[PDB]
Amino acid sequence: YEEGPGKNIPFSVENKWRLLAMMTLFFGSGFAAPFFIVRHQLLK
């Protein structure tokens, strides 16, 4: 296995803009989920 900074994580930090996309999807999916669950319950 690869060792050292940027190499001990399950995501790539090779490109800061690809990283920004992955972090946005990651944290944004978590933050969005409850809003969509409330919408799902209201739409019943």
């Binding site: 800061k16 920004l20 972090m23 946005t24 999807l25 944290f27 944004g28 933050f31 969005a32 809003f35 969509f36 409330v38 919408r39 209201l42 739409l43």
Partner: protein, 40 residues
């Protein structure tokens, strides 16, 4: 703590982009749901 100079420095403009995209990723989806609550 001491550190090496940044391998890939993030300029003020680059920080403004990162911060803006970060904020929008939180705000836009929740905003869409809260704006359409009436429609539910």
């Amino acid at each position: 703590i001491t550190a090496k100079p940044a391998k890939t420095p993030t300029s003020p403009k680059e920080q403004a982009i990162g911060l803006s995209v970060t904020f929008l990723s939180f705000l836009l989806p929740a905003g869409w749901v809260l704006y359409h609550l009436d429609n539910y």
